[model samples]
Target: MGVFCYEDEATSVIPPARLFKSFVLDADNLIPKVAPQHFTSAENLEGNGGPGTIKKITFAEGNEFKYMKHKVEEIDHANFKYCYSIIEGGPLGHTLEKISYEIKMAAAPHGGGSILKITSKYHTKGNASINEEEIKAGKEKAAGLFKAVEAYLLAHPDAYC
Candidate 1:
């Protein structure tokens, strides 16, 4: 497999613990609620919310693809780190074997908010080329989702506390 990787970061006005709780721990229940237009539902096909768990997420109509499945690789609650691999669906399009993601949430140096560090590794099919534009689009979508969750938390002061 040929692998292409990229890193991105986002700073949020939410605490690391609270952001991790809502964005990573409760994502299956919270994502669809926060972005109903993009995601229809998220369900676990096997295992609990831990390593080896598989999650299937369905996208809303009008999207380029229907659904995707991801396997949980790791979750470190104490350190606010999560890792997962997209083993099937969405944007893979016969070109990629899988997409692995590592996300870390850290306390901001000068604020009560948090800083997010993300690393994305695209494992391509043999001899296939990776598209930088596609990667950028995916990153934008992720950033949008992060903002949506941040907005939700800001609107509801009691959430994920």
Candidate 2:
């Protein structure tokens, strides 16, 4: 019941570009570098960082899951968005496709910091190998990433941005 999933507006303070650079293009793979507890690596599997690009990523060892890879099929620079197909890895024990994902950002007029929204939609595949509880735990692993980015920004301030 949780495979074909979507998550939007899941974070705060992080800008879209920075988030894209850090999470997608990877800021020199900083997300995996800094948040090694969650992500291990992100390697390009298709065309560099543009549309039709594919990336193979590995997540850190977890309780009931291993790693996953994805093939990027689309990226919109102006809108700060990207879409991909889940190729390999992932704790969810079955092979799935049509996994499109995107993250958007916008400035807040007042004193509010920028807002970064992320959306992920994937095709749900049935796998008697993994249970729902394991999938839930696997998705929650990104919590560390969110906290790590926040901490990194709070300290760096500009972050060479």
Instruction: Name the best candidate (by TM-score).
Output: 1
Residue 21 displacement (Å), model 1: 1.5
Off by over 4 Å in 2: 1-5, 15-28, 32-42, 58-68, 90-100, 125-139
Model 2 C-alpha lDDT per residue in residues 56-146, reported as the tens digit of each score = 6655544243356666667776666655555555443455444455555666675457776656555655552334464455446555556
Could you give candidate 1's per-residue lDDT for residues 1-161 as a string of tens digits?
A: 37888888786677777678777887765766755564365667888888788877775545444367778878888879898777876556557777887888888668777788888888777788878787888788788877777677778968645
Task: Give candidate 1 regions above 4 Å deviation.
Answer: 32-39, 59-67, 158-160
Q: How far is candidate 1 from the true structure (C-alpha RMSD, Å)?
A: 3.9
- Model 2: weakest 10-residue lDDT segment is 58-67
Best by lDDT: 1
The ten-residue window of minimal lDDT in model 1 covers 58-67
Query: What C-alpha lDDT values do all the predictions have?
Result: 0.75, 0.58
